[PDB]
Tab-separated table of C-alpha atoms in Angstrom:
chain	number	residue	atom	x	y	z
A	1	UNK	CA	-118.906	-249.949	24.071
A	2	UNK	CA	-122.200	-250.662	24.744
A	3	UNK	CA	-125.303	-253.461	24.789
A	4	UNK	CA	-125.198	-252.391	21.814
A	5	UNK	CA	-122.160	-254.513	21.291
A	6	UNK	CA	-123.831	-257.447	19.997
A	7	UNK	CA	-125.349	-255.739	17.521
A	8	UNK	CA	-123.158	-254.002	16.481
A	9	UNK	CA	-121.123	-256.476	15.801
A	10	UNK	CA	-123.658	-258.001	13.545
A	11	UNK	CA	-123.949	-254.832	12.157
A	12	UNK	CA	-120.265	-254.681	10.978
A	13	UNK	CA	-120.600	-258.051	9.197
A	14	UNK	CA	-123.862	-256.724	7.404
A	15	UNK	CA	-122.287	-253.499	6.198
A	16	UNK	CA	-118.717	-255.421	5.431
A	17	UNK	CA	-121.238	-257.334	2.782
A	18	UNK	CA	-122.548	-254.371	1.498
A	19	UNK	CA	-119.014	-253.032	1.699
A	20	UNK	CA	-120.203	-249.827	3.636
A	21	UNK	CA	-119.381	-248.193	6.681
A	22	UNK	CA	-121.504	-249.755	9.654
A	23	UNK	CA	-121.778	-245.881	11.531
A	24	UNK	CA	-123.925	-244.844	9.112
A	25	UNK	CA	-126.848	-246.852	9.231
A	26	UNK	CA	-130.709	-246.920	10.325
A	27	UNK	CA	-131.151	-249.281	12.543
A	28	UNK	CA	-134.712	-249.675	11.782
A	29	UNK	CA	-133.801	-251.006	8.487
A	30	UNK	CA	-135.223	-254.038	7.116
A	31	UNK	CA	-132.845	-256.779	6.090
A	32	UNK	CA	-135.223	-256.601	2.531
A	33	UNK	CA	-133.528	-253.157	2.129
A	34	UNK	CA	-130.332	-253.922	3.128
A	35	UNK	CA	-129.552	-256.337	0.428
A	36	UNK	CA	-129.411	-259.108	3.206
A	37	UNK	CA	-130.416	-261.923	0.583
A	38	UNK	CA	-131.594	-265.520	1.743
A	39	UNK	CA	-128.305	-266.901	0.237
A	40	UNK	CA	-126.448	-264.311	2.066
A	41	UNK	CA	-128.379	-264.606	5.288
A	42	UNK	CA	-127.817	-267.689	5.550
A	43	UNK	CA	-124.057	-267.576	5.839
A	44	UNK	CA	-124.751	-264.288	7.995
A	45	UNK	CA	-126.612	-266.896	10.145
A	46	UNK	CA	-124.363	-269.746	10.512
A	47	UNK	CA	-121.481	-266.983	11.367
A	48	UNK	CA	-123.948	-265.795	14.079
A	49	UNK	CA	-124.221	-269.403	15.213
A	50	UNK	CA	-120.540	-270.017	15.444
A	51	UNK	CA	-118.775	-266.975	16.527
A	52	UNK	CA	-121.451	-266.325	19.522
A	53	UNK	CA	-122.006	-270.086	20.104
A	54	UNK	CA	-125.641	-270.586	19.959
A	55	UNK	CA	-128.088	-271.961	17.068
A	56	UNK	CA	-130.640	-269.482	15.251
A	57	UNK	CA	-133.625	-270.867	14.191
A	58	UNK	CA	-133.720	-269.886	10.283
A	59	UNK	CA	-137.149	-268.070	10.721
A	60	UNK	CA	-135.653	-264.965	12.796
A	61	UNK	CA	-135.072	-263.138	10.023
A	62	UNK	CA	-138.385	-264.202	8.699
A	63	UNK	CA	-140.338	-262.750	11.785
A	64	UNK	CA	-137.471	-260.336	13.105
A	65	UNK	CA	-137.399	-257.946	9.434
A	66	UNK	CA	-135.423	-255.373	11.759
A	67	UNK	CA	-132.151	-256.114	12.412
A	68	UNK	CA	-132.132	-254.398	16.041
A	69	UNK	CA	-135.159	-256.197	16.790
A	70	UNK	CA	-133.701	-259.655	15.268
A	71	UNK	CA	-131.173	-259.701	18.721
A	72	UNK	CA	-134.472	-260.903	20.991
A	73	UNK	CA	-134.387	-263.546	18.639
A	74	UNK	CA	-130.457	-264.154	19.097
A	75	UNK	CA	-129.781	-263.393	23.007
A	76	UNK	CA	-132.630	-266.100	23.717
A	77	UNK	CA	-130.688	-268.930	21.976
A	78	UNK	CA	-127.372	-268.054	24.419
A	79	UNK	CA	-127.452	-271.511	26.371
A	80	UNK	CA	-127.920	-271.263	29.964
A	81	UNK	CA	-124.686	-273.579	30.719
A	82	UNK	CA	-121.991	-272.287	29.697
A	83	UNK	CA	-120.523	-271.215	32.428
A	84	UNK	CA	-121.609	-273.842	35.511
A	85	UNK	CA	-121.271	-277.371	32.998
A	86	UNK	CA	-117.905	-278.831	34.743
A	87	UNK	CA	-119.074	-282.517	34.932
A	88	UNK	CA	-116.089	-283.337	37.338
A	89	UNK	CA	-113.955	-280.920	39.166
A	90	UNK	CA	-111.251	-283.591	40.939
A	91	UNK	CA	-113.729	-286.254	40.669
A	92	UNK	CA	-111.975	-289.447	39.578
A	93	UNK	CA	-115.046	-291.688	38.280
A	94	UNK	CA	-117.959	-289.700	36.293
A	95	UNK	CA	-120.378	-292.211	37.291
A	96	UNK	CA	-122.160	-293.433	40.497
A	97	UNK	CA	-122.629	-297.119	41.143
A	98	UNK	CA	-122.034	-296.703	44.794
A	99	UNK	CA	-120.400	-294.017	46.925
A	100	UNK	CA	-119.837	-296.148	49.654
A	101	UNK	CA	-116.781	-297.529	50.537
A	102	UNK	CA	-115.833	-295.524	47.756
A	103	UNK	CA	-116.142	-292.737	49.166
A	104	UNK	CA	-115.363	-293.586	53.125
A	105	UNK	CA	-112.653	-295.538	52.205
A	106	UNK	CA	-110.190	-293.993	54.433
A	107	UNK	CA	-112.960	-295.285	57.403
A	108	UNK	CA	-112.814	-299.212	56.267
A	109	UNK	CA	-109.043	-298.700	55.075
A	110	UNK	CA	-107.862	-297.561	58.635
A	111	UNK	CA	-110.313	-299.932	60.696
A	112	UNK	CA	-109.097	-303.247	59.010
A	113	UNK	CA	-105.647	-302.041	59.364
A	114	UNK	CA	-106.095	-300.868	62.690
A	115	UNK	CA	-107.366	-304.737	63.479
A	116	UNK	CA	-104.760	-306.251	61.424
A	117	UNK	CA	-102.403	-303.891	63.921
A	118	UNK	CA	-104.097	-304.750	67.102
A	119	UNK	CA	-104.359	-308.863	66.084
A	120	UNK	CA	-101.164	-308.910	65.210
A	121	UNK	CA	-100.223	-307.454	68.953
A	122	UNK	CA	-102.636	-309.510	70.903
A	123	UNK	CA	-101.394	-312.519	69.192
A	124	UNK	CA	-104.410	-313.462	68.141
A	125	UNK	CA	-108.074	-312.110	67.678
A	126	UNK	CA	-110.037	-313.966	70.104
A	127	UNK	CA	-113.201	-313.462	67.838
A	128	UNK	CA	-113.526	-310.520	65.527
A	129	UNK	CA	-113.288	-307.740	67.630
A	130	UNK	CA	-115.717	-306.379	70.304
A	131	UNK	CA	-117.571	-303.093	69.976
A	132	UNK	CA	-116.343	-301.924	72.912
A	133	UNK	CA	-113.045	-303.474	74.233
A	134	UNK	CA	-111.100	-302.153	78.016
A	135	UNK	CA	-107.570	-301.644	78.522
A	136	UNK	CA	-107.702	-305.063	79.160
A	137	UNK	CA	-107.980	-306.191	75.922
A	138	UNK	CA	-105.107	-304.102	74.380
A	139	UNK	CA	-102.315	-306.136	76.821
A	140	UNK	CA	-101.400	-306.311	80.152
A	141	UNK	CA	-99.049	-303.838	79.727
A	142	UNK	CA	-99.053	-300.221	78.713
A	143	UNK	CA	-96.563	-301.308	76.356
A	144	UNK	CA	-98.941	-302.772	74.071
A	145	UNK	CA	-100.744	-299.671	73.892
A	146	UNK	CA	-97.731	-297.227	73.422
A	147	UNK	CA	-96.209	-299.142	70.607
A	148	UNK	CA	-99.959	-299.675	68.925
A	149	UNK	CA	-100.694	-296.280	69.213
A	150	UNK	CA	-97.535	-295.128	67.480
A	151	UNK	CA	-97.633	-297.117	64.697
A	152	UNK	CA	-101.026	-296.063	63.775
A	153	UNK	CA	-100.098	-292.485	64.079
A	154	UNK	CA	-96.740	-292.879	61.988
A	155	UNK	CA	-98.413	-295.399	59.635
A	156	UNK	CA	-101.391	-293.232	58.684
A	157	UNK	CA	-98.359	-290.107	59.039
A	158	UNK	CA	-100.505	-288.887	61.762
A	159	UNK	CA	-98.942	-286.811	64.871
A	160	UNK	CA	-100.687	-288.413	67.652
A	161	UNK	CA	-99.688	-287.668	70.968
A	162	UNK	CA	-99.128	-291.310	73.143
A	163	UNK	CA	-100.734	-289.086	76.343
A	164	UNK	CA	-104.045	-289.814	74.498
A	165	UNK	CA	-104.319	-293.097	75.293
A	166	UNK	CA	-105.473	-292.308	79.200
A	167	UNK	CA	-108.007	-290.754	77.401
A	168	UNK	CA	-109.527	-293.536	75.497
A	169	UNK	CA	-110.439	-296.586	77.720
A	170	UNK	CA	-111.958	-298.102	74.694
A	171	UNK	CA	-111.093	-299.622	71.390
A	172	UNK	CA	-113.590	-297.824	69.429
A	173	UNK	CA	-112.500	-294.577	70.855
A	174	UNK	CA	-109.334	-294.080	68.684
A	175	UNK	CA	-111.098	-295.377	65.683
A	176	UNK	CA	-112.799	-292.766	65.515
A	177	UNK	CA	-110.561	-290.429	66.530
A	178	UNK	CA	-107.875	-291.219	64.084
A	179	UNK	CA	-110.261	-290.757	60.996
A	180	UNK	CA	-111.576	-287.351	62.338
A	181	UNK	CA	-107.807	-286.374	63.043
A	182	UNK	CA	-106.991	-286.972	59.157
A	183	UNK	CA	-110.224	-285.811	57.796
């Protein structure tokens, strides 16, 4: 139709109370005039307020005595969130007490499994890891590594090539590898 949509549409109501046709009509026309009564405003109003989903402050009429002049009174109330007010979109917890390990979970999850899988191997962890760590300390035999290096690819269901190895001389290498390779 028009802008003039909205008020129109207000319009129609008005007229359907004073059971005439809403085309013929001055749209300078005071409410007063109209027949708009308080008791009929009112419900007017509160169909306003639920049909266009906003709140009119009862004194529009009272300053707005023209009902074309009345929408400044009704666009303004149209709430500013109604489109953008998704709280969560695939967010599992609507609250924040830490987005740590919450959120890098796959990071700890894989690193503690990864030394679980590497302990297990080597027997024993001679400490608690070392942030560094040669060839030497994943065997004496490329075994070790092979076998390792495959079960963290297929247990994280991760294609990781076994050629990759000769790449990474050092234990942290692949931990961060692996997590970059999933994420």
């Amino acid at each position: 139709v028009a802008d003039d949509e909205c008020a129109q549409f207000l319009r129609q109501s008005l007229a359907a109370m004073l059971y005439c046709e809403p085309g013929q009509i001055r749209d300078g026309s005071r409410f007063l005039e109209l027949g708009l009564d308080s008791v009929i405003a009112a419900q007017w109003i509160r169909e306003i307020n639920k049909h266009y989903q906003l709140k009119i402050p009862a004194d529009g009429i009272y300053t707005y005595p023209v009902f074309k002049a009345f929408t400044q009174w009704v666009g303004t109330q149209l709430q500013p969130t109604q489109a953008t007010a998704a709280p969560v979109q695939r967010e599992p917890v609507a609250t924040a007490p830490q987005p740590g390990a919450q959120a890098s979970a796959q990071r700890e999850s894989i690193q503690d499994y990864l030394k679980q899988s590497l302990g297990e191997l080597l027997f024993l962890d001679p400490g608690q890891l070392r942030s560094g760590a040669q060839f030497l300390d994943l065997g004496m035999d490329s075994v070790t590594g092979t076998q390792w290096m495959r079960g963290v690819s297929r247990h994280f269901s991760i294609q990781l090539a076994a050629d990759a190895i000769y790449t990474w001389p050092t234990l942290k290498s692949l931990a961060d590898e692996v997590d970059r390779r999933v994420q």
